[PDB]
Assembly symmetry: D2
Amino acid sequence: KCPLMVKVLDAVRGSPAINVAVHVFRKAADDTWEPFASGKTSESGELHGLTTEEEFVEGIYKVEIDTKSYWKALGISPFHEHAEVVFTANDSGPRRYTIAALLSPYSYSTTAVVTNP
Amino acid sequence: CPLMVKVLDAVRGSPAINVAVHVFRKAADDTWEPFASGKTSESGELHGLTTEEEFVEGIYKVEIDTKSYWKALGISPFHEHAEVVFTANDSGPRRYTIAALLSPYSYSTTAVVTN
Amino acid sequence: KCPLMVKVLDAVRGSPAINVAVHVFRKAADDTWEPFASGKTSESGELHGLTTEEEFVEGIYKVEIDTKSYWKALGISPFHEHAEVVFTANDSGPRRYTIAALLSPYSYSTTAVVTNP
Amino acid sequence: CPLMVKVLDAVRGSPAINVAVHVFRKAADDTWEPFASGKTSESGELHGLTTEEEFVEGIYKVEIDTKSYWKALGISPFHEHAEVVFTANDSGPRRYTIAALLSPYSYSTTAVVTN
Ligand SMILES: C[C@]12CC[C@@H]3c4ccc(O)cc4CC[C@H]3[C@@H]1C[C@@H](Br)[C@@H]2O
Ligand SMILES: C[C@]12CC[C@@H]3c4ccc(O)cc4CC[C@H]3[C@@H]1C[C@@H](Br)[C@@H]2O
């Protein structure tokens, strides 16, 4: 909801990827990754409510999507540990970010849709 | 040499082997005329479809028969085939590689155009 | 709306692809492509209302997305004429189909999300 | 031979040339230890990163420095880099090709694992 949303789809089943764990980190002043927010995708493959416009300040963020556990639960041993998405946010003022990922066992893609509010 | 097709399997992390590929050229009456065809190799590649002489400017379609590939693997697919439609242009680079990455409910295709 | 929706995104701009022409065809009994529906994507990159559950019977359908005109209007000469999506629909009863496409000048992807109503 | 990286540019339909690539291996203290690196060739490829001897089972990360690539082209990009994280497994095929297809606001990566 509002400034950061994550959407995950399954390219094998043509479906939302449900119950996928997502961890967001923010680079701290000492160049370490600090925990920022986390959650799981819903029945629609979406994860809303990770942060607020106030909390989501300028910075470098990493969205980890735990794809390996997703595939393993479906009986599949996939190639990747997780899909990582690393980006600078809000450098030119607040924006609305949708981070999308499309998953296959040995491949994925990831796409950002960015809107000006 | 001027046209190659390369196909990968995103589920198995492998070349997509034995996939039928049909190339067509658009005729003056806007129908698709068979132009060349073959099956992908053990490396997922299909070479020797055409020649510099035959591959003149025009509109081409490459059909990759993905449904039969997934059916052989016992995996239910969405698409009948992947279609790639483009105009060949002499002003650009001399070689077209039409690549495709296949999943049961999604495909990605790219053109790598080089000299 | 209801059983067939098309969504188009621009991978260069990280935005919906707006005002993209979309033509849907259905294979007739004489194995020819008959016009079925058409429209343009909205400001959200979506195209709703192409058909109804009544009209969208079993068959083989082709969704043509006119990507070349889209890129040309942005000053770009792209590789493909259009993105084609060809599929059998409703073979096992009515379903809800979202046909998504992600566009770049020399590449695209397309993905179906299929739901049981 | 056991690890290759191949990078393509979806905007220009070309190999992505001169892209920095850094490989890391996960250490016992869960930090990332520099393992190998290089720049993609004129064919968008990076060979000779490691050896059969050195490429033991473990968790590896391949970072592809996409932001600097797009910046050089004058195109505003979204990601800092593309990351690819995986466990090397001796039970599987002997060669890993890590491929990536780049756009300014989207990337796709595949592992092609072969003998
Ligand atoms: C990058 C790629 C996967 C890797 C492919 C590949 C893999 C190994 C290799 O030796 C060559 C290629 C060329 C096509 C490449 C695909 C084009 C696009 Br459709 C796909 O994302
Ligand atoms: C995952 C996706 C980008 C995000 C798209 C998206 C974005 C926002 C949203 O609300 C829905 C979708 C569904 C299609 C999704 C695409 C399908 C495939 Br063609 C592409 O990789």
